[PDB]
């Protein structure tokens, strides 16, 4: 377990139970402890056509945190509209799609609002807020990280299109990001809002539109222009051929340009091109997943290391005496304690060695058959004893204290 990830995982926990007492926010029927998640105080909503507010809140029934997406000022004209779509999207669970749970209407905010409830992914920044934060930078986003994004969105689109649905909302600002893990965080919002809007399109025509927005989202990041426009696409496209691969340029070209009237488009055919890259993404994910696996051991072991640290600290400063066997054991422990924590070189300078402190305690944790040298102050007493023996001596000493 390194230094940076240890803080990264710590900040994730501080973020979850983080509260604002002066929030002046309500408590709804099913929720409480609301928390403003919006960084940008002034609000215009990229795709909703209304204003949007983001809240963290605890459920009442189970007490776990969820992300709330508040649509300020919507009129629930049809109850059919909501339940028609929350049922379908709730079924879709993907690693790159922020899972949507229910959707209800509440009036507590002081106005009529439509409320979507999502998974809470702490320390998520939007994809926008990450690669272009407000406050120069000419660094281009490295092609590999661009390919990871193609795959993760392709994975998300593959799921969405199979449920015979469409993303509808697919934008740089509506995609959260966490340690390079991007997820669609605005799904199912526009299904309700354009449920009975004029000029409704086919889900078959929406799915085709999902590819164009997709192509644009990447092309933006390539040319480092967070706001892109269909007016200059072709000019942008020429600018990526020297900074990036000819392969990538074709993928964007395919994704953005409309297909020949016979062909149609599907996620499958996108995946066919990027075969090599999907495998590399798969390889990275796995390796990261294994890296996590190691840490989940050493940090679970630390918990065990600590319970032993306790039992030791209890016996080694308590003196009260019966028979001589006790006097032998009680000495060995103090000498064991000195061997680890009180390591000193010649001239008595403190040999601090946190690797050393760990090594011994793991050996004690597993009852290692390795034997160490224990020495007294006057060098009178000398032991040659294995960790397995010492551990048993400790567990016994601590055990008798409780009787």
């Amino acid at each position: 377990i390194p230094k940076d990830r240890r803080e990264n995982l710590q900040k994730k926990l501080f973020h979850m139970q983080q509260l604002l007492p002066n929030s002046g926010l309500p408590n709804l029927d099913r929720w409480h402890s609301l928390f403003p998640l919006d960084t940008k105080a002034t609000r215009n909503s990229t795709c909703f056509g209304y204003p949007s507010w983001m809240y963290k809140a605890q459920n009442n029934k189970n007490g776990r945190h969820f992300a709330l997406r508040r649509i300020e000022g919507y009129r629930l004209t049809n109850e059919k509209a909501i339940l028609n779509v929350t049922k379908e999207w709730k079924k879709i669970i993907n690693a790159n799609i922020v899972t949507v749970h229910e959707a209800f209407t509440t009036e507590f905010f002081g106005d009529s609002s439509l409320i979507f409830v999502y998974d809470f992914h702490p320390l998520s920044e939007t994809l926008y807020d990450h690669h272009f934060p407000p406050n120069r930078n000419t660094n281009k986003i490295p092609e590999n990280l661009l390919w990871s994004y193609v795959c993760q969105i392709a994975n998300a689109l593959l799921a969405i299109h199979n449920a015979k649905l469409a993303a509808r909302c697919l934008e740089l600002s509506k995609i959260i990001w966490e340690n390079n893990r991007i997820r669609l965080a605005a799904c199912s919002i526009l299904d309700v809002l354009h449920h009975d809007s004029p000029n409704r399109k086919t889900i078959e025509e929406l799915q085709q539109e999902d590819f164009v927005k997709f192509g644009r989202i990447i092309l933006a990041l390539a040319t480092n222009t967070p706001t892109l426009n269909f007016n200059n696409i072709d000019a942008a496209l020429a600018t990526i051929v020297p900074r990036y691969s000819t392969q990538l340029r074709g993928v964007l070209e395919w994704l953005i340009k409309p297909s020949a009237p016979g062909e149609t488009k599907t996620v499958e055919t996108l995946l066919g091109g990027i075969t090599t890259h999907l495998a590399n993404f798969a390889n990275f994910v796995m390796q990261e997943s294994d890296e996590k696996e190691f840490h989940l051991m050493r940090e679970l072991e630390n918990g065990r290391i600590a319970r032993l640290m306790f039992k030791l600290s209890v016996v080694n400063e308590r003196g009260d005496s019966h028979n001589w066997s006790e006097t032998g054991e009680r000495l060995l422990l103090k000498l064991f304690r000195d061997y680890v924590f009180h390591q000193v070189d010649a001239d008595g300078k403190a040999r601090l060695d946190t690797n050393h402190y760990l090594n011994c305690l793991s050996k004690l944790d597993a009852s290692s058959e390795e034997q160490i040298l224990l020495t007294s102050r006057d060098n009178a007493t000398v032991f040659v004893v294995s960790y397995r023996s010492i551990r048993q001596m400790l567990d016994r000493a601590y055990g008798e204290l409780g009787k």
Partner: protein
Amino acid sequence: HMMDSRDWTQLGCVAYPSPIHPDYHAGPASTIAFDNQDELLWIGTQKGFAGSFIGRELKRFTAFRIHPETDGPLRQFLFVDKGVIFLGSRSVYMAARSGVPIWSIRHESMQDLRAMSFTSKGTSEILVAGWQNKMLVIDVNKGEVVKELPTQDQYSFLKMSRYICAATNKGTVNILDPITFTIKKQWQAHGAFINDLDTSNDFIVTCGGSHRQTHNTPAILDPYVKVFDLKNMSAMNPVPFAPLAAHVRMHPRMLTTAIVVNQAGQIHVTDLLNPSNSQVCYTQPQGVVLHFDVSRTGEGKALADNKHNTYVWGSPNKIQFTE
């Protein structure tokens, strides 16, 4: 016959307790003994520290106190597979050679123990005694006193061979039945004290003298080793030893041979069946010799003197303490 120097030299030496040892002020070693495994030599101090040393060069191995230091000297070692048994005047202690405690017995009837031996039960049981009118039987496996027996005679030595040979503090030797501990025979070895006893299945050998020390008279060792025939149960002719016999051990491989040592460190190796052939050799102890033992193979000889030195002598050619 003199010893060829190619057969007899000092192989290693150690001071125990040394000047930086907490028990140094109280005097020299109280006892020494070769272990019967792991190439160990054990040395006790006057306040109950035990030190063990490996091989002919006596590199330090382990050390630990086996009873409270006010109890005085470490009186005797015995060796079994599981560990080392330690006897003190007020208690009996058992620990692994590592120093790991096994059990501890401090019985009210243990007032001044001096000696211990095995019994009729192999290494599973020991008999302990001393300058007191009680004996205790200890189950070595369970670590508990299992029997108490009265005794009229007080003892300085115990060792099991064919029988339990028990040296009294008056210079006589009692031969005890190993099952019932009853006396089969009494032998008058020396006048007032026995300084050393060893035994094989066929022999007992002892060292001693006619009077214990007073301000009028030093304890003088007798100019012979007294010998008793365990096979035919009768006393034998003594083995003549003009330098005055201080210590004796039976040779573990030459079954009819005895090893005799005087206080100036002069040693004679003499066959009991024929005293005519004995090897004479000399050592160079700094002080007066106080204790002696031989290893199980017979190849290592150890001697501790009153200047706190312990020496190992033997052949320069790769000796081994045990198999």
